[PDB]
Ligand binder design. Sequence first.
Ligand code: NDP
Ligand code: SF4
Ligand code: SF4
Ligand code: SF4
Ligand code: SF4
Ligand code: SF4
Ligand code: ZN
Ligand code: ZN
Lengths: 198, 63, 118, 193, 162, 90, 287, 252, 338, 56, 86
Amino acid sequence: MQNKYMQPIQLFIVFEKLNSKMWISKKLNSNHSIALIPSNWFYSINLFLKRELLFSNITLIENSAIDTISYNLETNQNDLDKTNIENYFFKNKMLVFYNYYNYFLKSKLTLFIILNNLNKSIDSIDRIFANANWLERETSEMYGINYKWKIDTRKLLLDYSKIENPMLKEFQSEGTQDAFYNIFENQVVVLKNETVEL
Amino acid sequence: ESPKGEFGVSMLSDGSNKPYKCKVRSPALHHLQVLPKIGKGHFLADLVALVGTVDIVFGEIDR
Amino acid sequence: LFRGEHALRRYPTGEERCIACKLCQSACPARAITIETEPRPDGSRRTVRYDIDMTKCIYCGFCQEACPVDAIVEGPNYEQTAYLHEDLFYDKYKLLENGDKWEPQIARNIEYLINQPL
Amino acid sequence: GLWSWTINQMLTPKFWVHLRREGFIKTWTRGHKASRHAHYVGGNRTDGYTKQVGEDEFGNRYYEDFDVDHKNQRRWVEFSDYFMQMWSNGDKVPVGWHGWLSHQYDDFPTRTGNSAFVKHHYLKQHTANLSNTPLNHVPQGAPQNLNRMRFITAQRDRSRAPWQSPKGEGVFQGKKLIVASNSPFIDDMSIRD
Amino acid sequence: MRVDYIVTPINAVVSWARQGSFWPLTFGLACCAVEMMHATVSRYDFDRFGVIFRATPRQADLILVAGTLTNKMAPGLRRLYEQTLDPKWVLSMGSCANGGGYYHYSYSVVRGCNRIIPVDIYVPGCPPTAEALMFGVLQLQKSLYRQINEGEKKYNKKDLTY
Amino acid sequence: LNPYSYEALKENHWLVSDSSKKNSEWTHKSNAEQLIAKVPIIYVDSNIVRCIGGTEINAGHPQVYIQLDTRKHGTPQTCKYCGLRYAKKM
Amino acid sequence: SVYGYGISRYNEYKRAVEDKNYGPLVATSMNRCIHCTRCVRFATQIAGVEDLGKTGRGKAAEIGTYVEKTFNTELSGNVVDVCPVGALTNAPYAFTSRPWELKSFYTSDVFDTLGSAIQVDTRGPEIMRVLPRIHEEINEEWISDKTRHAFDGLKRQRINSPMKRSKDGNYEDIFWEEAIQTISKKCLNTPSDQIGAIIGEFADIESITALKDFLNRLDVDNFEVRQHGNLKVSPDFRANYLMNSKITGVEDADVLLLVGCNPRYEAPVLNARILKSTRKNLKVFNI
Amino acid sequence: GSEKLIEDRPYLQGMPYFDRFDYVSMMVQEHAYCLGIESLLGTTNYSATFTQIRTMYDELTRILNHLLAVACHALDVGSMSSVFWAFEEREKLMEFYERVCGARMHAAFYRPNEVNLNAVSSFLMEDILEFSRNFFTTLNEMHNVLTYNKIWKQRLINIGTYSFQTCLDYGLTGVMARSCGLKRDLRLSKTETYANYYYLNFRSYTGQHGDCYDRFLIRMNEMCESLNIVNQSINKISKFNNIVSINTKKNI
Amino acid sequence: RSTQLKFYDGGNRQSISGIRATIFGATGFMGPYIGAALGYIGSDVIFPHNHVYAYDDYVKELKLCAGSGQSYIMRHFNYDDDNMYDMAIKNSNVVINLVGSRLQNKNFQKAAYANIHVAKKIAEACARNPNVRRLIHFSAAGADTKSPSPDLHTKFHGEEAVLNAFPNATIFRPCTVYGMQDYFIRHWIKERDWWYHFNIVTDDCTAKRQPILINDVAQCVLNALKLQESAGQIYELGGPHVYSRLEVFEMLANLSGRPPKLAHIPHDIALKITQNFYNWEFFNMEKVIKDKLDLIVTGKHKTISDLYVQPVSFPQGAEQFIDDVRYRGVETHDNLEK
Amino acid sequence: ALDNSFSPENIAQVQSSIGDKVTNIDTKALALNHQTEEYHKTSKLVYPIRTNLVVE
Amino acid sequence: INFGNYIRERNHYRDPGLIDHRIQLGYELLYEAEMHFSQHTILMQYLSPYNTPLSDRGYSYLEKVKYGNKSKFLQGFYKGNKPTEF
Ligand SMILES: NC(=O)C1=CN([C@@H]2O[C@H](COP(=O)(O)OP(=O)(O)OC[C@H]3O[C@@H](n4cnc5c(N)ncnc54)[C@H](OP(=O)(O)O)[C@@H]3O)[C@@H](O)[C@H]2O)C=CC1
Ligand code: SF4
Ligand code: SF4
Ligand code: SF4
Ligand code: SF4
Ligand code: SF4
Ligand SMILES: [Zn+2]
Ligand SMILES: [Zn+2]
């Protein structure tokens, strides 16, 4: 609208075995296209993106995940159709989204992947985009995502000697432990926490 | 276009008075990530100068 | 407009302005305000507890904007440094005496701010 | 605190006018009451000294000089207590003078006449920071409070008031123990007619 | 009794000196650190009151906690406090340090730096203006000046302490 | 009169009263009840009175309207924001 | 907020209404009434009382009783839940709480032998209010006043620790171990035929199962010591002592015969159901 | 754990968290959050755009951030005095914050659909123009101890050099992307502009070597262009022409 | 009077145990540990003190024994006014007295003031207040009415006075307590570091000791509070084994690798010099006098086993406190990495 | 305590009750202000801007 | 043996991908321990005994003597699960 736009349809032309599901919205920028991608083709798709002409001049802008196991419409429950992208947030255990920008085509591309396995396994693309190292490390530690063929799997932002995924809906924002100084040991320890409530 | 680069918010709402998801895209994280790439082979003084040149703030990086 | 130390105000007659509507409690982003209310024997609704954890507060002024009777305000005082962590647990006595001490300046500032839209 | 008025600052008409009018002790101590700059004692000018815009309930004096080299040094206060260097702190300025000295407004309190500030019957007098003194703020249940138990017991009794057990010797009817009821309400249907 | 004749005056000279050169540790977390650095520059000169920043804890006299303290940083803060030379004082600046602050309900934040190290004074704001930080530092300076002789000893019939 | 009696409760919105008004410095942590009781009744000519708790809008409380035409003539009424009491003149 | 224009243009005096006194359960603020008639219809058609109405005409009409009369009845507080505005409010629940600072739980009432489905709203360790639920086989939508308000009897006169009584009548707080050891010694020393129990009004299945198993282990088969006031019903069959036609049976029957029964006090919601059925050809006889 | 907290509050209660993201430039974070909320609401803040406050204060916080960055970088390199000046000249911008919201750093000023119109007065813009005029001089003062200094050049030139390929691989944006040579400015993008930026006239700068010297020069020039943008906005909310007498062409 | 004290020990720093305690003499070595043992389960602790330097870490760190709103430090305590004692224990159902004559002190009058007068005042204040359930008074194992040490004599007299004033008080007599900041291992390390070549001994080192770790005395206090049968009893607390001073020297030498060297000075010279010269922590009459006395469990009273505590052995418990002062001799290449 | 819509007698009575010596009000003065909307009172900053000095 | 007890408590796992994730986390925590990234009082939580006292300090056997032959339920009944003041 009032600008030149074209769908990224060549991606599904080259990958002939994939269904195509794309969205454009006025809540996004007028050059932003959202597409749905299966998990078992993500690495090959990123390989194609990194090198193909008019896609090679691309950068990875953002990466994150959505815990859709507790996603519920709170208002206007009768205004949902079969074409709404939020219709794909139901019954799906996990969602992962990647956002790239293309300088030649001056376009934003978001790709969505549905993870429906309990172990939450997906191939990493940090060997293709150098951005994905820290982004994927943070996503994996926050949401319990198991990334395969990753350069570095160590924790990025979480505390030492702890295993937890605080960004899951089951997790309470106050955690399960608190840090105190211990006189009997002359050093800091961690204890089960009792917290104030408003 | 924040003074430190492209700063973004990607947020999904379920129709209530609270956001269901809010993710913050900060450029200081990417700059700190690239710092080892451009800092290898340099001296310690050069590393300090490079940390100065990348306008990184850890409230944005860590959040 | 400076956001300093919190205070509870009074009407010119000496009556409390706060009617225990709990809008300021829900407006607080830091959850620093705790309020409990009982009917005063004369019938008016007043707080039996109104306290603010000043170590939780972010001094944002959302509570003074939410108040519909201008009861809770942020005063001009900033020299509120304390030696104990318990000196920053503000109860109703502390806020009331802060309002009773800083009332002239707060009144002048609020008068100008009110006249600004007019 | 020697040379509160320097020799170069002396021989100035301002110094002699101040000494002739105010005296020696008041003039000399003006360099101790405020310690901004050597050339600023009594005001930046030389022909005369700055008239005080006002005074204080604790004796502090407030001056405003428009001939200062930087805009931020227009208004200042000289305290009545100047016992040591690093002795007078910023919490001693009262309410209206606080706003005047911080350049919030251009109004200042006056002892008598038409005032720009309200004077209600419930106003308290300004007090300095009372921390690290026996008059600090104590929460009602803190161990420092000698009457902490009245507050704790009431908070407990808000949702669970314990039953007062009989104490001492009592009256027995078989095995039941007889006491008077604790209800403050009146059972009017047993007294009505 | 006679020793006091020498000790009581000299005490002042010991306090005055340590009140005249109060060197805090160069350590800042989050954005109370930015406010503190504002409080150090020429508009509010700590160097007027003999306050200059030293980078190592062995040369520091005051530890100034001026930001959020996470569970990842608590052992480091404890070590930094332990490795400072006595006598030392601790200033807690801002809400994140005085208590939990705006992150009191979080899973990775220490609910106040006084759970790890003792604190001598608290500065409440978020951020406390350079005005308020200077006020708190001056209050601490006066308190530590007076702290050497608070009248703990009793006076005998000769008006001599113990 | 007994504050727990039927008449006292009925004429006090079914609450236990306090004539001394000195229980509220502990229960409600202030002496506002005494101060508001020190203010006499305002007698209004008309049947309805408008209260804003001040000289101007936004300095006080939202506009409220109090009926003075009562079942019993001249019964005073209390503003529910400020404690001021009004009655119809004669 | 959702459907209105969002701003006003009315700039005149509003009408003011003097408040009425309905009793210690219902608080009135009649400036808020919108003349919706919900309270009148509830009182007439559900409660069965004819004390409410609309007197007057035009804008000056008023809702309520003509004379100074209390709204005394069971199921009175329910009218509050019917009124959409703050015109009628829960008088015990006055000014104490706000909706957003409450957590709700679903449970059932024990104050009357109808297990009314109820919702308990609490704030921290304090229970703040009780509301009705929807069941359509119990209490429909409504609860009695005792169910709604008598929960505040749990906040006082509470026993908070084990106690022992001396011969003179003095009570001393003791530990759990000492009390249990004393009772165990008494159980071991007392003959089987000298042991008895009394089953309380508020006794649940688990408690009675535990006590029955323990006393059976102690070779005790008596669970009453009171001489009179015992129910003369055999527990051999479930149909012996139960409501075989269920609560909804009052809708199914055409002739009801009460024998020593006062539904207005023992089950007010069942009384309302019977009233609804009698409006639909149900005949009631009483002995 | 700020994102979890934001997910645990209503929308307005999480907005101050953005103030604590990148606490050197505060109102840009609020602007991004409010833009996201407005996009989810499908509306625009006309009161903010027709008053030019968002663009103006975005440029002011841009000057704040670049002042702090340049001063701290010079302090790290070894130039000690320059940090005292940028901090004095960023005290005036802190006063400008305090005059509209009552806070010096964490404004919490921008709102999704509300603008406190009464907080903005004409006397504030004149002081902003005074600040701009003196900021020219202070920026020249910082200019003549660093730009042509041999030690500064030998410390920053050909240090941390990279090209556009790395600049794409590592997702570099902003000043770093303009130093690698890429022309990427969101304000000047046709489909991605916001808050009056598309209808002003300012310049943006790109380097040709991709090193620390280019970034330093770009930051100084960006401060100057921010001054220019602020002047343009104040001109857009100004009334220049007056009424003149019919005869003699004399102003009334 | 009632000695019952019901409390919940299954909580943490932010819980409510049910104990409100006042601890006297907490500006020494025991103080922080006893206060932490009480306040780590959610108790309220009050620390009255009159300390010469208020900025010393001996006062500030007492604030760490409990959380905010639970620990209070009462300053400028008179130790001579009955009103202050009443104010200190007004809302306390547990009182602990750790006041005692300090090692530097050699004056008999000051020793009596610390060990008898202050303890008597505390016990009398406890008797007046009817809400005090348990009082724990700390004494010495070798306390005796004919001891050459004024500290032990005055401590025996203080035991008598406390048991007279408050017949439901519990007396603890530790043998000798070691820890991070103690006068047993820390003094040994510092004396060897100052006298680089030797440790000074003024006797034949045949006196017997029964060391006990500081972490066990706190557990003993908690167990005594939990036990209602310990109300009016005297307990002597020591370690599992009894060693002579020479054996302790040898054990400390072997645990750290430092070769022992005990330079001997005759007893009378040391006594005269410590009598006629100024005394401080590392040079005083008390060390000279006590080095000839046995501080062990004598068996006349109840022992640590009656509190159901199993103390750790001295070699096992003292090893971690000398890790930094280990002898650096011939080591493997892998030991260079730390 | 009361706006202009109230009679001057009522305003004066309330002000006397709350003990208001400052801002005196008379029935003649309050009658003119009764039922009247007016702007806030103002002052003037008169140029030249200078310092007030004491000399001779 | 204590860490083996930890692993034994993790024996019921049957998803290989989850096990690979756990092995990655274990290697990460071991590397943190061996490079002084973590604190000893923090990392000792994985090496501490499950039902035995630590060897560097004494222990209390009071609750062993009083509740000698009593079952676990009785021991957990005599010792409450909440504070008793409130
Ligand atoms: N630790 C050990 O090896 C053993 C200790 N004990 C005894 O246990 C008790 C506690 O032990 P510990 O902490 O190690 O001993 P300390 O000597 O280190 O502490 C003594 C305490 O008593 C105070 N005190 C001393 N003299 C006076 C006085 N005249 N008036 C008021 N207060 C005074 C001190 O405070 P301040 O000086 O600051 O005023 C300090 O708080 C002492 O009585 C000690 O003798 C018994 C056996 C072994
Ligand atoms: S926002 Fe104002 S009126 Fe409401 S409960 Fe708070 S102080 Fe009271
Ligand atoms: S200023 Fe903000 S954070 Fe502080 S009490 Fe008010 S609403 Fe809460
Ligand atoms: S208390 Fe607030 S302003 Fe201060 S450092 Fe913390 S987040 Fe920043
Ligand atoms: S429910 Fe309320 S609005 Fe409706 S008729 Fe009744 S009092 Fe009026
Ligand atoms: S909450 Fe409802 S009934 Fe109450 S006044 Fe407001 S809109 Fe009307
Ligand atoms: Zn009113
Ligand atoms: Zn004797």
